[PDB]
Amino acid sequence: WAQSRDEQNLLQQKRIWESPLLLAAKENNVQALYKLLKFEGCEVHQKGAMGETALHIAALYDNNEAAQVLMEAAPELVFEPMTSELYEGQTALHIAVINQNVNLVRALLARGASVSARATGSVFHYRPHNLIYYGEHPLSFAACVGSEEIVRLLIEHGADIRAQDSLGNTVLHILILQPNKTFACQMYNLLLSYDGGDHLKSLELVPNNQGLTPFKLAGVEGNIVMFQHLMQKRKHIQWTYGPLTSTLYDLTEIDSSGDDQSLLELIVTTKKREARQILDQTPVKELVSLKWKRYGRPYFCVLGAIYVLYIICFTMCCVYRPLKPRITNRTNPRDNTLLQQKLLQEAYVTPKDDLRLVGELVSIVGAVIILLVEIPDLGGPFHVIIVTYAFMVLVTMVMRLTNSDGEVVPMSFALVLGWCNVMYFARGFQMLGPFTIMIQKMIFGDLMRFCWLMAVVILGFASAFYIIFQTEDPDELGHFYDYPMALFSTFELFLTIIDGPANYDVDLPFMYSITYAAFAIIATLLMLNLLIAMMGDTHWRVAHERDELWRAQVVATTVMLERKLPRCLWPRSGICGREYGLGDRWFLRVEDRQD
């Protein structure tokens, strides 16, 4: 697709060269325009490759003199849009506004150029392959280029500030997506000066297509300067006492009032890393910290202690499995067999089997409660593991009443997944909070690397060892008696967790010694190169990323507890302004001291 516009831009230059009229508009050749327009009559309404006219070209390459000749000879060219799909709807005013040719913009508005002309072409879409997004209407173009002179000039000729684009963005929504945050604030206020001024139907209230007010969209995008600027409109200073200043905050669009209306709801769910810095701002960080000091952290430990006991209950039923002898003399055929099956679905006969029964009941009513609170739909795996555990418990009860060969298989998965999910609660316990994020974040980046290389390394060394020792006999060495043991023993050899094959009475093959020396070296190199390469995440910037991602996890977990738990506990944050002076809204008291 990108080659098409590359072809079309190259094609347009060819059509500009071929057409002697369009070339004069590109090169500002006033002398040639008069000879073509007047003496040797040429098609003045000439359409170019991009469906453009000579006036579109005269505005692209800032040539006011050539543009004025075309308008004095054919003033209807001003209203003509670009017919091409890439530039559907663009007019010569859009081009003159974005190039800040005020004299051409002034002269174009004299011809009555439509200020409501929408530029709906594909190069004007809010897409990553487009380098800018200024909206559709010419007023938003002037707002994004920072030309305040053209902005008021377009308003004077009847520009509507409430104009929404394809994505329902008002001119305020578009300014927040612009890079220059420090200069767009002054431009932002200039547009609000032409607002209706009434307390209702303010332009700051018109939401996005995704249901986002300009204030709320600024927080999601991570725009700090606009979020700070928009905050002045909703904070009220109570009094000034020396260095102390007590400020009251409106807290309306920030708190979790509506189901999805909450701004905090949007900050924890969005993918932008810059949005993490919004909960550090001075309306939010005081709020989210008060929600964690009281009603947040204490309930998390309560739910933590409950889940830990529930796992101990399930763990106790797994250590006290049904017990039974082997009931078969199968142990001698394939004499390596070591099993003593213990499965028997006795009716009751319970001196203490009823004790583990209610534990199997707690585990069932627990796994079904777990499965009925998460499936009715950062903390990713630690919430996908619990449902996998609850799945295993229900499958284990289906392994019961069927008592298949692998009774331990789905039950063993529930033990590791049940305990390794207890360190989910690490996110709210100070010391190991960021630590769990550390072990969680590398499982993707620094684990898949060196794992695909460890796996590929053993498939060369493990397969060698089997060749060296299927000629020998499994009786004395036996580390590589079949192929699966060759892979599994060498894997353990890679981590040095087993002792390394060594038999000094017998004589080992002369190929084992050379291969293992190379294995012992390579296994240490890739092991040391896992350590020092995984060490790069120790920059003092990561010192924030270790911590400020843990604070983000605490804030994200704080939002989780308040949504599901009833309103009887965890009252609404702040103080309701009703029964005070500020009508039925909730406010937060924050006082500071400036040095």
Ligand SMILES: C[C@@H]1NC(=O)N[C@@H]1CCCCCC(=O)O
């Ligand atoms: C230069 C082209 N010639 C023309 O007459 N209009 C085009 C303007 C190019 C703007 C592309 C904006 C974008 O990347 O979306």
Ligand SMILES: [Ca+2]
């Ligand atoms: Ca050892």
